[PDB]
Design a protein around this ligand. Sequence first.
Ligand code: 1F0
Length: 85
Amino acid sequence: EKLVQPTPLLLSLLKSAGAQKETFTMKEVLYHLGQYIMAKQLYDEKQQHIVHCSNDPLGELFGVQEFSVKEHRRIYAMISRNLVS
Ligand SMILES: CCOc1cc(C(C)(C)C)ccc1C1=N[C@@](C)(c2ccc(Cl)cc2)[C@@](C)(c2ccc(Cl)cc2)N1C(=O)N1CCN(CCCS(C)(=O)=O)CC1
């Protein structure tokens, strides 16, 4: 599997959620981002698949401040913009 390298901001969020390295598989990056979202309680109370970013630094990585965990292609796109090329 390919080990990717999150840029500064993204990496900071992953480490806050428990990540302890600099390179990860995309599966690991996503797992840690999910943990970050749960830790920060960014998910919507009523529609739990919805993630609110307008009040969190995670919002800096998205154009539209709300995304669904069901939007895998969109989420992969966001991460790609935050990987060392
Ligand atoms: C952060 C929220 O993530 C998810 C939330 C949901 C619910 C709550 C809407 C169903 C479903 C799937 C999830 C959920 N889907 C995952 C697998 C995923 C994997 C790849 C991609 Cl591209 C997108 C999503 C992941 C890892 C996630 C990863 C990145 C991001 Cl930005 C958000 C979530 N995620 C996750 O973190 N959890 C933790 C909480 N778990 C809670 C499981 C509870 S239960 C009763 O359904 O078993 C479920 C898995």
